[PDB]
Design an enzyme around this catalytic site. Structure first.
Site, PDB file in Angstrom:
ATOM      1  N   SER E  32       0.842  -1.185   0.000  1.00  0.00           N
ATOM      2  CA  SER E  32       0.000   0.000   0.000  1.00  0.00           C
ATOM      3  C   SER E  32       0.881   1.240   0.000  1.00  0.00           C
ATOM      4  O   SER E  32       1.888   1.294   0.713  1.00  0.00           O
ATOM      5  N   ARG E  33       0.496   2.236  -0.791  1.00  0.00           N
ATOM      6  CA  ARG E  33       1.261   3.469  -0.910  1.00  0.00           C
ATOM      7  C   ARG E  33       0.915   4.505   0.148  1.00  0.00           C
ATOM      8  O   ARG E  33       1.569   5.551   0.199  1.00  0.00           O
ATOM      9  N   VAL E  34      -0.096   4.256   0.982  1.00  0.00           N
ATOM     10  CA  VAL E  34      -0.471   5.243   1.983  1.00  0.00           C
ATOM     11  C   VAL E  34       0.688   5.462   2.946  1.00  0.00           C
ATOM     12  O   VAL E  34       1.318   4.512   3.431  1.00  0.00           O
ATOM     13  N   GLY E  35       0.985   6.732   3.213  1.00  0.00           N
ATOM     14  CA  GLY E  35       2.155   7.104   3.977  1.00  0.00           C
ATOM     15  C   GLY E  35       2.057   6.746   5.446  1.00  0.00           C
ATOM     16  O   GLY E  35       1.152   6.047   5.902  1.00  0.00           O
TER      17      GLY E  35
END
Lengths: 57, 116, 49, 245, 177
Positions: E32-35
């Site tokens: 997942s790219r969520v920071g």
């Protein structure tokens, strides 16, 4: 007739401490496990009975 | 990429790396089932060197600062080619492979390797 | 020989302490879980009402 | 593509068939190897009994029995096979050899190594180390003569270091060795085969607590030990081959 | 099209569900790219390097058939991977809050359950968990308010952990040391 009693006592003493500490540790483990098992059975049966009476009511 | 544009050392380094990776891929099919026991040591060393050089290319850019929580790194080209030539000399065979994972430079390489 | 009998008293004392504390903990667990289970049964009772 | 896939299927199926066939070859060889290995027990038992009886009331002194005053060096012999496809057998043998060399390096001695097998021959030739002598071509099927000559050579080499003082060979004229080591593998089970290293160069006397000698007892003793050493050497090889299979 | 259009995905495969573990989540491709703003700072500090550890565990478990190579060099790695894999499993219809789950992840990261046999680790934590529910809950409120693990709570919880595990017995009746 007296230089063998000293070695007999030495042989007895060399193992008395080991036997006593082994027995003490065994009894310690036995009592600890017995008490924890009793407590676990008590909590399990109390939880089961609580669930049962709650289901009935 | 041409020797007329860039010096011959860089050309040689690139050719050697390319040949090593090509040989590794070629042997991958056989190693996929049987492994290195059947294979000879003359190719076992090649397998080891290919694995180390492949793991070394990993780098920690600063853009991952929002994911890895670590700063980025930069290296001049002269240091890069020197380190790669040193690795291709095979001196670093004694070092563990995992140390090459996500490293900045040869100084950090040595520090990490000797830290374990 | 004199030192041989030192550990029995402390062993029994800690055994008693463990027994009483685990009995108290089991009692507290049983009463609390019965409390929340009965309260949730009453809750679904007013829910179905 | 399609034809590449079909050809790979053919190749892999044939490899499957012949791997199972040659595995059955190995299984069949196991039976005869186990039958052959277990026939030298009576002679070894008799040689042990005779050695015990002879040394029971004999003089306790022999160059093999005594030890050199200085630890100048230590010989070592490591066994290997004459065929590949053995798995980690060679790897286990080499790991044991490296561990033993590391252990010996603690004393600061310079050892000399002797190796049997073509694979370890190539492995050590590739590395930077000397090998005085090697033996190949009969590890699969040995004979008493090879073990006998090997034991003779090793005993002579050990004798050749009686007066090795410093770098001087002395009356021996050739630098000799003061310690020997044996490396092989044992058949603990059909699945348990652990590499074992043993030291048997200097004899040690132990008393567990509690006939006629027509020729000279000392001469009988002196001639008797080499037979015992040779029988041990011969017994090692069948065990190694069984573990290999 | 669906992977191209969106960002971040989770992969479920029938394999791990077949071998027995119910939550079947792949650890090498599912990303997942969520920071990092999604996690709480407590979760960020307590949890780290899990994905890489699982990946290297999945790589190294391919050579479990040869113990002549490891030789007591990655035994700890193998054991920790096994304990973590056994930890991640979840039962059915079992809602869980952030508090106890961050407690569990801290306990797994610190490796204090290494002595516990694999056969009962699960139920172990459950007992531990409920005891901490029965015991003082000040630490839960503390880490719920400041949203971070204070150190004093750390010594308090490890002392409680030692006290509980000393009083704990294994499935076969062997106390942990």
């Amino acid at each position: 007739a007296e230089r063998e009693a000293m070695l007999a006592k030495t042989a007895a003493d060399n193992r008395k401490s080991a036997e006593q500490v082994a027995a003490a540790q065994a009894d310690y483990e036995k009592e600890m496990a017995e008490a924890r098992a009793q407590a676990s059975a008590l909590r399990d049966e109390a939880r089961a009975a609580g669930r049962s009476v709650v289901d009935e009511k | 990429l041409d020797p007329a544009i860039v010096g011959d050392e860089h050309y040689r380094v690139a050719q050697e790396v390319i040949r090593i990776l090509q040989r590794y891929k070629d042997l991958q099919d056989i190693i996929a089932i049987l492994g290195i026991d059947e294979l000879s040591e003359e190719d076992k060393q090649l397998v080891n060197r290919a694995r180390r050089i492949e793991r070394f290319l990993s780098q920690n850019m600063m853009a991952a600062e929002q994911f890895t929580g670590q700063p980025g790194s930069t290296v001049p080209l002269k240091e890069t080619i020197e380190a790669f030539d040193k690795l291709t000399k095979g001196e670093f065979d004694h070092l563990p492979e995992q140390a090459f994972f996500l490293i900045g430079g040869l100084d950090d390489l040595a520090k990490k390797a000797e830290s374990l | 020989l004199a030192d041989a009998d030192a550990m029995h008293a402390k062993a029994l004392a800690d055994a008693k302490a463990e027994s009483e504390k685990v009995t108290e903990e089991a009692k507290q667990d049983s009463e609390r879980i019965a409390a929340q289970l009965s309260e949730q049964a009453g809750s679904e009772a007013e829910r179905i009402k | 593509t399609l034809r590449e896939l079909r050809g790979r299927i053919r190749s892999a199926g044939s490899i499957k068939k012949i791997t199972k066939a040659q595995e059955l070859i190995a299984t069949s060889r196991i039976a005869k190897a186990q039958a052959r290995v277990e026939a030298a027990r009576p002679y070894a038992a008799e040689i042990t009994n005779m050695l015990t009886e002879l040394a029971g009331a004999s003089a306790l002194d022999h160059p093999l029995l005594v030890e050199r005053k200085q630890p100048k060096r230590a010989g070592v012999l490591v066994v290997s096979s004459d065929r590949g496809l053995c798995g980690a057998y060679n790897a286990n043998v080499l790991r044991r050899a490296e561990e033993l060399f590391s252990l010996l390096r603690d004393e600061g001695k310079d050892p000399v190594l002797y190796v049997v097998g073509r694979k370890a021959l190539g492995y050590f030739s590739f590395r930077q180390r000397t090998v005085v002598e090697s033996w190949t071509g009969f590890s699969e099927r040995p004979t008493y003569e090879n073990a006998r000559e090997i034991a003779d050579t090793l005993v002579n080499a050990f004798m050749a270091g009686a007066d090795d003082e410093g770098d001087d060979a002395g009356a021996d004229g050739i630098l000799g060795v003061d310690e020997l080591h044996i490396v092989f593998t044992e058949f603990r089970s059909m699945l348990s085969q652990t590499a074992v290293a043993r030291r048997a160069a200097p004899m040690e006397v132990e008393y567990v607590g509690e006939y006629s000698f027509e020729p000279d007892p000392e001469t009988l003793f002196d001639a008797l030990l080499p037979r015992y050493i040779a029988t041990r050497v011969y017994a090692a090889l069948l065990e190694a081959a069984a573990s290999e299979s | 099209n669906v992977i191209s259009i969106t960002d971040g995905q989770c992969f479920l495969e029938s394999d791990l569900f077949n071998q027995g573990v119910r939550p079947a989540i792949n650890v090498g491709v599912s990303v997942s790219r969520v920071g990092g703003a999604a996690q709480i700072k407590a979760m960020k500090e307590v949890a780290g390097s899990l994905r890489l550890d699982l990946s290297q565990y999945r790589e190294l478990e391919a050579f479990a058939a040869f113990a002549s190579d490891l030789d007591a060099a990655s035994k700890a790695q193998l054991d920790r991977g096994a304990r973590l894999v056994e930890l991640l499993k979840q039962p059915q219809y079992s809602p869980l809050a952030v508090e106890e789950q961050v407690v569990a992840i801290f306990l797994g990261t610190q490796g204090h359950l290494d002595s516990v046999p694999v056969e009962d680790v699960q139920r172990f934590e459950s007992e531990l968990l409920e005891h901490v529910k029965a015991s003082h809950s000040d630490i839960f409120d503390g880490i719920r308010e400041t949203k971070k693990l204070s150190e004093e709570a750390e010594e308090k919880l490890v002392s409680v952990i030692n006290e509980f595990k000393k009083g704990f017995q294994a499935s076969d009746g062997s106390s942990v040391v």
